[PDB]
Amino acid sequence: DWVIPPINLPENSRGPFPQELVRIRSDRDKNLSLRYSVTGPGADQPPTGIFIINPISGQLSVTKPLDRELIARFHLRSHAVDINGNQVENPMDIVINVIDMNDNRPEFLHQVWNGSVPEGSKPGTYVMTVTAIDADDPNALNGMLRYRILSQAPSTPSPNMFTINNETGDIITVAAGLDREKVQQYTLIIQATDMEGNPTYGLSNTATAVITVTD
Amino acid sequence: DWVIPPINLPENSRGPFPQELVRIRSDRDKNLSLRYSVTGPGADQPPTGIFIINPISGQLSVTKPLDRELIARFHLRSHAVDINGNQVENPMDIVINVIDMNDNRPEFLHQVWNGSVPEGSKPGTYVMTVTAIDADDPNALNGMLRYRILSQAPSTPSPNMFTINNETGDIITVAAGLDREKVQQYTLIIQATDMEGNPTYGLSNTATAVITVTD
Ligand SMILES: [Ca+2]
Ligand SMILES: [Ca+2]
Ligand SMILES: [Ca+2]
Ligand SMILES: [Ca+2]
Ligand SMILES: [Ca+2]
Ligand SMILES: [Ca+2]
User: Which one of A83, A132, B12, B21 counts the least CB within 10 Å of its CB?
Assistant: First the structure.
């Protein structure tokens, strides 16, 4: 069979609805009067009525806005029948990929994280790991996160005693001079931002990490 | 066989080129490496190079702006061949319609039209008929004319002694007091305007109508 290629379709479709996707037809038109129809999950199986087809023209249409997070792919099959109901073509697979859109922001597993670190710890010492998640596709830019520290109270002896690992969320000491008798609890605001942490196009969320220095 | 439907295309395309039309493929690409091509007047036969297809991806494209008044329809055929060169599908017929654009203004059959009317004639008299053509599609708005008079000479006894049949181009008298000893010859300027005469968008052209009154 000469098949039609996969239909890639951005989620949160703008409208107006029902928007057309593709017109299909069987070259048997010229002989006899036909009737088109589509079957499978999306059409005549739950969730029904999302994809519809014109019995006459073969114009396949989508009715509602899609959501990759709910259904990321639809496998449909189109058919062709004559006036007294007989199959005139081998049902064609129509694959519909719901393309991902950056429609939900990062989310830390907790609002406050807690960590510890012994005083006078050599630069390079590991303290704790914050992690966040994103309901977008991890393979798409929409789902790829990057962490950064925004603030650091108090700001002594250095205004950045710590560094966050860009990708992994692991926090490390860069500075020396951790002295409990001077600063007991550093408090960081970490920001996880998506799309490789693109400032303009990236969504963000923040959390807090409280690093107690111990004796 | 399931086939792709006709492709519609406005003439006088803007670009940039090559602008793509439709991606086709054969479901044999899963088994073996394929190679697509196109044939016919428009592809490999004269005029050559207007339409092309990507050997690997099957993306069909247009290279140049089209012109309905030169070629209004293209009959192509797509092929799919295996590595060694054998056909792997029945060539698919591809129909391409060049949709009309209003790209040329109306044209009168004569610059100067002559006509007659007996003196003192009744209001309602046919005197002559003027007709203009249009190289655009008669059935589209781009080729549907509306005639009308722009000015008269002289403007006595009335400033508008005549009127034009809005659609047909039959000129009809709307005033009496025609007299060879007062005004021997009138001379009108008629204006054919396309697109149901739409003053804003429609293109126009003018011609003359010389109406002699007789004893
Ligand atoms: Ca969504
Ligand atoms: Ca996101
Ligand atoms: Ca998404
Ligand atoms: Ca043209
Ligand atoms: Ca035209
Ligand atoms: Ca025209």
Answer: A83
Classified as helix, coil or strand, B142 is: helix
Q: Which CATH class is domain A1-101?
A: mainly beta
| Rounded distance between C-alpha atoms, residue B129 and residue B122, angstroms | 18
Contacts of B80 in chain A (CB under 8 A): 2
Domain limits, chain A = 1-101, 102-215
Which residue of B2, B38, B54, B77 to mutate against A (max A Cβ within 10 Å)? B2
Task: For residue A27, report the phi and psi dihedrals to the nearest 5 degrees.
Answer: -65, 0
* CATH hierarchy code of domain A102-215: 2.60.40.60
Residue A5 at interface with chain B, using a CB cutoff of 8 Å: yes
C-alpha distance across the termini of chain B, in Å: 75
The experimental technique behind this entry is X-ray
- Give bridge partners of residue B66 from the DSSP assignment: none
From chain B residues 71-90, the ones with a CB under 8 A of any chain A CB are: 80, 89-90
Cα–Cα distance, B102 to A214 (Å, whole number) = 82
CA separation for the pair A88, A83 (Å, rounded) = 11
Residues facing residue B192 across a β-bridge: B205
Q: Are A6 and A40 in contact (CB under 8 A)?
A: no
Phi, psi of A55 (to 5 degrees): -50, -35
Resolution, Å (one decimal): 3.3
Q: What is the DSSP string of B72-110?
A: -EEEEEEEEEETTS-B-SPPEEEEEEEE----S--EES-
Tell me whether domains B1-101 and B102-215 share a fold.
yes
Q: Closest Cα to residue A118, out of A184, A163, A64, A67?
A: A184
